[PDB]
Amino acid sequence: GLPPGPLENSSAKLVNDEAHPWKPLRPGDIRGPCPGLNTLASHGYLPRNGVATPAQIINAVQEGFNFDNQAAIFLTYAAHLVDGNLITDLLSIGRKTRLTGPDPPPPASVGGLNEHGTFEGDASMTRGDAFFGNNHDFNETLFEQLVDYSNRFGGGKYNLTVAGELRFKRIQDSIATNPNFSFVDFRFFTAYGETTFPANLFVDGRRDDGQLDMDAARSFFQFSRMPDDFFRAPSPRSGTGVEVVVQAHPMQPGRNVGKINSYTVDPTSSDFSTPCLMYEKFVNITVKSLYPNPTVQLRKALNTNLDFLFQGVAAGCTQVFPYGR
Ligand code: HEM
Ligand SMILES: *[C@@H]1O[C@H](CO)[C@@H](O)[C@H](O)[C@H]1NC(C)=O
Ligand SMILES: *[C@@H]1O[C@H](CO)[C@@H](O)[C@H](O)[C@H]1NC(C)=O
Ligand SMILES: *[C@@H]1O[C@H](CO)[C@@H](O)[C@H](O)[C@H]1NC(C)=O
Ligand SMILES: *[C@@H]1O[C@H](CO)[C@@H](O)[C@H](O)[C@H]1NC(C)=O
Numbered sequence: 001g002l003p004p005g006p007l008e009n010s011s012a013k014l015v016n017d018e019a020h021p022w023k024p025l026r027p028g029d030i031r032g033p034c035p036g037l038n039t040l041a042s043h044g045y046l047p048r049n050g051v052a053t054p055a056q057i058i059n060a061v062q063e064g065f066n067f068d069n070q071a072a073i074f075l076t077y078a079a080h081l082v083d084g085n086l087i088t089d090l091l092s093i094g095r096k097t098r099l100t101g102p103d104p105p106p107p108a109s110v111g112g113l114n115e116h117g118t119f120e121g122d123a124s125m126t127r128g129d130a131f132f133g134n135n136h137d138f139n140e141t142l143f144e145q146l147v148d149y150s151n152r153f154g155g156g157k158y159n160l161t162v163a164g165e166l167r168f169k170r171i172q173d174s175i176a177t178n179p180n181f182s183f184v185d186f187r188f189f190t191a192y193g194e195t196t197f198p199a200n201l202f203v204d205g206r207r208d209d210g211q212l213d214m215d216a217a218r219s220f221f222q223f224s225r226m227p228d229d230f231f232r233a234p235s236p237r238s239g240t241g242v243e244v245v246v247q248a249h250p251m252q253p254g255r256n257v258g259k260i261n262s263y264t265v266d267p268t269s270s271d272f273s274t275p276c277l278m279y280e281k282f283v284n285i286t287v288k289s290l291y292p293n294p295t296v297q298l299r300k301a302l303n304t305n306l307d308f309l310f311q312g313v314a315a316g317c318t319q320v321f322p323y324g325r
């Protein structure tokens with residue numbers, strides 16, 4: 001379907017309401033590396049089995065959290081292009097599943113959001129790097145580090161100051177321990193934005209003060225659960241304040257080169273000075289590598305979802321056409 005538009009009414013309101021109760025997982029229910037989508041599935045803003053259409057995801061992040069429309073469109077269609085089934089229009093918010101339908105031919109993976117190196121990547125705050133065996137489940141040791149950083153830099157709350165320090169710590173931990181650490185292009189951008197999301201979207205909208213308490217943080221990150229009486233943010237937003245996180249410890253895009261402590265800058269990578277390059281490489285390299293020579297029906301679905309992706313791209317970038325117009 002067409003990408004949903006912005007909310008008609010973006011006021012703060014109770015989103016942990018009678019129509020959207022938290023429920024535990026049933027056998028087969030999928031949760032993944034994103035605490036936002038996980039919480040929306042566990043409150044029935046998304047299908048509770050964790051398999052959704054792009055339009056369901058965009059409507060859920062707007063209605064449940066007041067995620068802004070352009071951000072919702074960009075992230076949802078990026079995820080769907082690399083991890084979703086373009087013919088059935090279904091995406092898993094976690095593991096690969098037969099529930100997204102018959103797979104396209106290799107080298108397309110349709111691996112769900114758990115697929116490493118498409119959307120998901122290294123130096124996550126509460127999830128381990130894929131090299132360590134699990135890129136999707138809540139990790140208590142990593143969450144306790146988030147609590148420690150909140151105690152040291154946030155007066156016991158998670159805020160953008162904490163985000164700036166923790167983002168850098170996770171990068172340094174990956175450089176020191178993950179010989180395959182990758183921090184370029186799409187992951188370089190999204191890794192910084194994601195650290196603002198708890199301060200911008202997990203804070204009760206009646207306060208909207210950017211100070212996330214650790215009880216609320218655990219409820220979202222571990223249990224995919226809104227606090228009792230949770231109000232969504234009082235206006236549409238996503239990554240506002242990402243400039244604070246970058247400014248704390250400015251990094252160049254790069255990777256470990258098959259050994260720990262070998263972080264090598266990639267001059268072919270996009271960085272925050274070249275946001276349009278990040279979009280162009282995502283389409284021309286990442287998407288194209290999954291679908292190098294698609295059949296007629298796949299080509300049509302790709303071009304449709306690429307048009308939708310471009311709706312989410314900041315004004316001033318040129319649309320690219322890997323399969324023609
Ligand atoms: C709009 C569509 C969305 C998509 C497709 C999406 C997808 C993802 C994916 C794949 C990751 C894992 C990246 C990684 O850490 O390796 C992630 C991380 C994250 N997402 Fe989402 N997300 C979306 C919206 C949101 C929303 C609305 C929120 C909050 C309300 C949110 C909060 C987060 C947070 C906090 C993380 C980082 C988790 C961590 O590092 O421990 N996301 N998202
Ligand atoms: C929008 O929603 C808020 C809170 O639910 C309500 O108080 C406000 O009056 C509504 N605006 C419109 C469109 O009625
Ligand atoms: C290692 O890095 C490459 C890309 O540089 C990626 O294809 C691969 O999945 C990574 N594997 C793990 C488990 O990190
Ligand atoms: C959690 O992360 C820690 C720290 O990186 C790691 O040592 C541990 O194996 C991870 N897994 C679990 C299940 O705690
Ligand atoms: C984070 O909280 C600490 C303690 O209250 C404070 O020093 C710092 O200014 C806060 N940062 C933000 C961005 O609010």
Ligand SMILES: *[C@@H]1O[C@H](CO)[C@@H](O)[C@H](O)[C@H]1NC(C)=O
Nearest residue numbers: 277280281284320321322323
């Ligand atoms: C992407 O491909 C288009 C041609 O379809 C080209 O104009 C553009 O320069 C390419 N961008 C990159 C970064 O490769």
Ligand SMILES: CCCCCCCCCCCCCC
Nearest residue numbers: 071074193238239275313314
């Ligand atoms: C890439 C993730 C950043 C956080 C989301 C907010 C920005 C809205 C998406 C626009 C992307 C533009 C790329 C050129």
Ligand SMILES: [Cl-]
Nearest residue numbers: 006068069236
């Ligand atoms: Cl919006």
Ligand SMILES: [Mg+2]
Nearest residue numbers: 120121122124
């Ligand atoms: Mg990750």
